[PDB]
Ligand binder design. Structure first.
Ligand SMILES: CC(=O)N[C@H]1[C@@H](OP(=O)(O)OP(=O)(O)OC[C@H]2O[C@@H](n3ccc(=O)[nH]c3=O)[C@H](O)[C@@H]2O)O[C@H](CO)[C@@H](O)[C@@H]1O
Length: 450
């Protein structure tokens, strides 16, 4: 049996991509052990009931958890120190077992794992879960060719589209941690000389030239994305309709029946992000702008954010809008009545829109969302970004006009045609013989040779 370890960043918001990749690997005959923390094992249902199910290895005792008194630097230092010892202790045992691991695939945000693997003589590779465009930006910040505030009005990197400073990732949302955040991201490219491979959560037709640029750094690059459940793509992995490893228990849904009565391609699905907080002022303009379009809309917004909606808003859109606390985003985007997706452009949501063929109204808020939005509008051409003013407020007029332009304007047919092409190309990449399937097959072949 060929056995490997997968070690994602141990957070709910960061583990889905390699859980999905793990499922593609076990479908090809690889035995996978998920290395993780007590916290993740307690909050997620990771155990499958089958012979080839991902094996869960909890290697921590919770002492690596953040304390309320920490600066981000202190939390990161304690995590690295304790998890370095935890991984060393785990490999001490695993490397002398009956079927020792032959490789460790780890999140790119834990670059310290490479030095542990190096000491043990264990093959290893980081997984970059975000876009390949972010790899180029972060690499250029590490090597001095770019700065956190761009020193120039325009940015022309190699094999990339032109970027304005507003298109660059915004991580100054927490000004005391900005320096720590940039050091961690730039540290993901520092030790790649010793990586067996570099894995990226993207596909060749989506970021081909950037991937080719990344291949000039000296190491083989394997695109294995999009990491979206097989049911919404190639359908080659039996009932894989969710991101997790345990059996899928669907929630009671009020969204699909409502969508069933609406005309095909007519409704705007709205989500500004499951963990994004929006100010009352901005939420009011967003709400009224959607209302002014007169379109049917399905807005998913969590209970603590829903309390910030204007009074009488929900009652005022009783006819055209369904505002709910939760829906299955994949099932909503796959529904034929959904014709546009108002999104914050998180990388997960970006790939879901591309895989499901839905045009977008882009409303990025922080981090890599701004760069993803730039690509959705200006490179992939599946939608438009909401214009904000000199105070960064997107007005209700700016929200309404953007929605109308994507769904009804001169380029509306272009966006739908482009969305349909990307859906076809994303499915092709992960289906048999595709660019991502080939890379996965190549990895599995390499593992079979040890
Ligand atoms: C790529 C990534 O790591 N996350 C992105 C984003 O979220 P991301 O793009 O992951 O967006 P969400 O947090 O909204 O979604 C998380 C997951 O929950 C699902 N979902 C969400 C809401 C809902 O009602 N139902 C549902 O099923 C989505 O399909 C997705 O798979 O997180 C940050 C937002 O602060 C971004 O900076 C990240 O780039």
């Amino acid at each position: 049996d060929t056995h490997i370890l997968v070690f994602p960043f141990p957070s709910q918001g960061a583990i889905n991509p390699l859980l999905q990749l793990s499922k593609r690997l076990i479908a090809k005959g690889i035995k996978v052990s998920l290395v993780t923390t007590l916290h993740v094992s307690n909050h997620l249902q990771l155990q499958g009931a089958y012979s080839n199910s991902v094996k869960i290895e909890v290697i921590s005792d919770g002492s690596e958890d953040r304390l309320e008194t920490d600066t981000m630097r202190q939390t990161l230092d304690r995590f690295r120190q304790k998890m370095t010892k935890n991984l060393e202790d785990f490999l001490q045992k695993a490397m002398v077992s009956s079927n020792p691991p032959k490789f460790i695939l780890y999140a790119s945000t834990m670059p310290w794992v490479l030095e542990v693997a190096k000491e043990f003589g264990l093959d290893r590779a980081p997984f970059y879960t975000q876009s390949c465009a972010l790899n180029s930006i972060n690499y250029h910040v590490l090597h001095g060719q770019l700065k956190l505030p761009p020193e120039t009005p325009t940015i022309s990197l190699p094999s990339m589209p032109l970027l304005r400073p507003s298109d660059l990732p915004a991580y100054d949302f927490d000004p005391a941690s900005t320096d720590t955040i940039i050091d961690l991201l730039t540290s993901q490219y520092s030790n790649i000389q010793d990586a067996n491979l570099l894995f990226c959560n993207t596909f060749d037709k989506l970021e081909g030239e950037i991937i080719q640029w990344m291949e000039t750094l000296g190491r083989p690059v394997k695109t294995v994305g999009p990491t979206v459940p097989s049911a919404y793509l190639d359908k080659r992995v039996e009932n894989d309709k969710h991101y997790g490893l345990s059996l899928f228990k669907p929630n009671e849904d009020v969204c699909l029946k409502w969508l069933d009565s609406k005309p095909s391609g007519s409704v705007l699905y709205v989500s500004y992000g499951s963990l994004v907080e929006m100010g009352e002022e901005q939420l009011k303009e967003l709400a009224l702008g959607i209302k002014e379009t007169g379109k049917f809309f399905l807005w998913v917004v969590r209970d603590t954010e829903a309390e910030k909606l204007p009074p009488n808003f929900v009652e005022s859109v009783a006819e055209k809008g369904l505002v709910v606390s939760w829906c299955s985003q994949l099932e909503v985007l796959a529904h034929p009545s959904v014709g546009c997706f108002f999104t914050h452009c998180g990388w997960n949501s970006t790939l879901e829109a591309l895989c499901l063929g839905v045009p977008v109204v882009a409303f990025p808020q922080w981090a890599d969302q701004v760069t993803n939005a730039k690509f959705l509008e200006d490179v992939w051409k599946v939608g438009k970004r909401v214009k904000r003013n000199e105070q960064r407020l997107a007005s209700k007029e700016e929200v309404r006009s953007c929605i109308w332009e994507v769904m009804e304007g001169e380029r509306a047919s272009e966006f739908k045609s482009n969305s349909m092409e990307w859906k076809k190309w994303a499915k092709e990449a992960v289906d048999e013989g595709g660019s991502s399937d080939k890379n996965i097959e190549e990895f599995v072949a390499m593992l079979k040779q040890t």
